[PDB]
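To close the section, here is one more complete example, presented without commentary so you can practise reading it yourself. The ligand is RNX.
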Amino acid sequence: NREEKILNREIGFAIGMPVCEFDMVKDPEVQDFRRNILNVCKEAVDLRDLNSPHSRAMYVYPPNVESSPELPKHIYNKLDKGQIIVVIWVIVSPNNDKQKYTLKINHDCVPEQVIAEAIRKKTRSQGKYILKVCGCDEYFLEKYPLSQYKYIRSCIMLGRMPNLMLMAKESLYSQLPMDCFTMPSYSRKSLWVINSALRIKILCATYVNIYVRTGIYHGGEPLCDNVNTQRVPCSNPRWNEWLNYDIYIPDLPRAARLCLSICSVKEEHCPLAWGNINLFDYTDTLVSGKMALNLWPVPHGLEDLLNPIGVTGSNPNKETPCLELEFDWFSSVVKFPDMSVIEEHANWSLRENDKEQLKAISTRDPLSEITEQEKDFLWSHRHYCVTIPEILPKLLLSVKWNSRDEVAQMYCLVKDWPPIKPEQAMELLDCNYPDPMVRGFAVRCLEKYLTDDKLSQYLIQLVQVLKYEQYLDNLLVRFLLKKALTNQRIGHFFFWHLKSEMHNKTVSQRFGLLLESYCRACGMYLKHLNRQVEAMEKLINLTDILKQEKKDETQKVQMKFLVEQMRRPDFMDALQGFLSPLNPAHQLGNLRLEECRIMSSAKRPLWLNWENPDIMSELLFQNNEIIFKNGDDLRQDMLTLQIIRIMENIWQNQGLDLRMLPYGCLSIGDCVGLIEVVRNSHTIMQIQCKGGLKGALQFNSHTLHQWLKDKNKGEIYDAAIDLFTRSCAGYCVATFILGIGDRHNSNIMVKDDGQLFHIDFGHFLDPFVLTQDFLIVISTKTREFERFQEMCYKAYLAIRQHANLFINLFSMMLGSGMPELQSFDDIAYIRKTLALDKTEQEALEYFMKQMND
Ligand SMILES: */C=C\C(=O)N1CCC(COCC(=O)N2CCN(c3nc(-c4cnc(N)nc4C(F)F)nc(N4CCOC[C@@H]4C)n3)CC2)CC1
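Output:
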């Protein structure tokens, strides 16, 4: 059992905690999860080794492609009569002489056709090759049309010219390890005949330093009124009381939970410690007998005396308030009925104006409240609503989940409900819908209609909604794990989104078990991941030192210390030669210390610089730069940049070229993160200072246009201006809709070619002062500003048509501890700025008026 021991050491390093901690967990659900998830592991491995080397090579090097092969009109127009010019590179002699061959080929050609044409053009002086992107580990291994590869479409939009390298397939396959996933060593009754009322005994409490407030909930809604116990003095926290609720035992839905908290009185009621318990365990058994639940500290800004959206389970730290409980015990062990009994009990238990009304209801947004009249209206028309599937969320919200009969009937309706878009299926995965059948339906919709591109695009939200799962073992987690173990690009960010939260002890168990399974089945990539981990490790340590020991020293003294520590051999091995967690296709070779530096003030961010060891680094970027910041929460930045990329995608696929810049930003831990470095970019303040009339002068705004004209002389000029306008327009709309924090001359940046973008998104959801610089680069009363206002109006409209998607994305992110996103009241800001309750012309006038100010 030696290979097993080495693998366990490596998984422990990668996860942070040792694997033997899991073994000591005497929880049946934990060991059952650990064993049962290996089925998904094995499915994924078998799919990897399914087709000899190619299957593995595409697991490790998946195609980075757009979901649709179709080209937007403006993207196709940029082609030369529908064709693209491409440079294919070949390394010939052992001296690595690079020889280039330029081709003009149809944009929809397959990599095989490109290789054929390249060899034809080369010999004018079989299928044993593959195409690599020059300068990074990205391959074109699949028979997609060239233009559908994200890199190629990017080259077509940016006017750059694609530079690919031809590579013998055997050279790549020889670099693929013979992955051996080894099986771990830890693998080898009534049915609500109880026609009664649910009652629970609160026994006593320990580690208390008042009354107990309890309730029965289904997600966020309460199935009956809350029940306060007898106010007892905190000296003797002993109640031994029986609480009876207005709920019949068989009326409890599958996902019924008990939410309790301990409260104090001054008059002034204050929560002290909260807790939540699954009324049914993972085996469908209705809990009975005694139960000790260790409670959790209250989160900041808690409205009520109960935390029902909080995670379920006993606090791992057992030296906390421990509440003792007793659940009724009946004839035998009680279990939730089988779907067959459900169908039996369901089978046992219309005007055109009304149809148009149902359609209009379905059209509304998620946050739009539905009236009780509308709820009963949707319910009385629950069979017609199967013709308009998207209305399913709202319909679900109209169910009385405290009634066995209605729950069974909705179950039947779901067993045959038509599939809906993934965008709309995700909404059914947030905290509003805990019912396992609805969640299964949403996961099935994702599994059938979600390409890996879109899966990557929404991976952060999917990982988040994981936390809303009632049990370790569920369909959503199995789906994500299988996609992660069959596509390494997805598995990279899967692993990192999970690890970045391992510090959160409310999700440590779930995410730790998940990471254990993943790392066990992920293959050789584990080693690579481990390297990344260690690197971050070192960085954190270093930065920690800088923020305490050498906290109050001068820039040059801190710089001397950083160059000293950075030069320690244990440190240099750790931070040289590994993959960029921001993008694993990017190798990071040796550190260029002469180029690393501490970034102005802040939490003392590190600006690091690596050589790019790619054989042809020069044709992409010879130096990669990243900002490691050990100070502030980056989750707000991640969500903002994801939304910006989604908005740019909408505008492109709709026909308005507003080039945004959603640069990379990855949260890797508790307030530790990485940020991409956009080359050839400067803040507006840097522009005004470099252009400062001189030493002892003001810094007027009129100089930005001069700086751009100096950096873009000749025919370039107009181009640059255009770029600047469009990007600017885009970001304006973006920042107005999301309500981003205070902008200023150092929050905004421009590149040497005119592109403008924003950075550091502190707070969102709680008016863009177009400088004279912006308006004069665009030129007040000019055709340029007319086109500018038209762009902005069109972009506002375009983003208003997808309001549901952004509202759902935020709703799903609510689960995260993100401060700027604690309640639906913060999200409502988007419903406000996009004028959802108003009409289209009304919202257009609203935006025009907001933009006049
Ligand atoms: C005229 C003399 C004078 O007074 N000077 C002081 C002002 C100049 C420097 O002013 C600020 C500045 O240039 N930089 C600080 C900001 N920085 C930056 N930050 C970030 C970023 C994003 N998010 C978060 N959470 N933190 C941070 C970071 F500040 F730590 N990102 C970037 N990136 C974004 C991607 O593209 C590149 C860019 C570097 N940059 C830039 C430097 C000097 C003269």
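Once you have examined the tokens, check your reading against these statements. Residues 599-600, 602, 605, 627, 629, 632, 634, 637, 663, 675-678, 681, 683, 685-686, 689, 746, 759-760 surround RNX (CB under 6 Å). The first helix runs from residue 2 to 15.
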